């Protein structure tokens, strides 16, 4: 099932840029059947596809496969890929709070 996670990322300056340290796939203009992380292959949402070792996203607890619902409160469930990318990389914002859902499993079914 999907568990809600609220992640708070503090962007890291790397030269000219403030980076988050992850990659995204998805968006309403992309082919959802190509998403290896979604449960529903018609899900055109924004997904975390990679997370950088030691980057802000990793430290904040973001995980590959996470579905991004909100960025600082902008809905990310029905945006284009570029729109998603732009909301995440606003240089004026050094803190980004993400609402995500995470495919999760009841552990220790036996013990």
């Amino acid at each position: 099932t999907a568990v809600v996670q609220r992640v708070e990322i503090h962007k890291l300056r790397q030269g000219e840029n403030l980076i988050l340290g992850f990659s995204i796939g998805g968006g309403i203009d992309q082919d959802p059947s190509q998403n290896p992380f979604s449960e529903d292959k018609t899900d055109k949402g924004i997904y975390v596809t990679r997370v950088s070792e030691g980057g802000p996203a990793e430290i904040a607890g973001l995980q590959i496969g996470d579905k991004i619902m909100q960025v600082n409160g902008w809905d990310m469930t029905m945006v284009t890929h570029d729109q998603a990318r732009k909301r995440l990389t606003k240089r004026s914002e050094e803190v980004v709070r993400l609402l995500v859902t995470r495919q999760s499993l009841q552990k220790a079914v036996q013990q």
């Binding site: 992850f22 796939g25 990679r50």
Partner: peptide, 6 residues
């Protein structure tokens, strides 16, 4: 499946 690095 394009991805973007941020």
């Amino acid at each position: 499946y394009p991805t973007s690095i941020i």
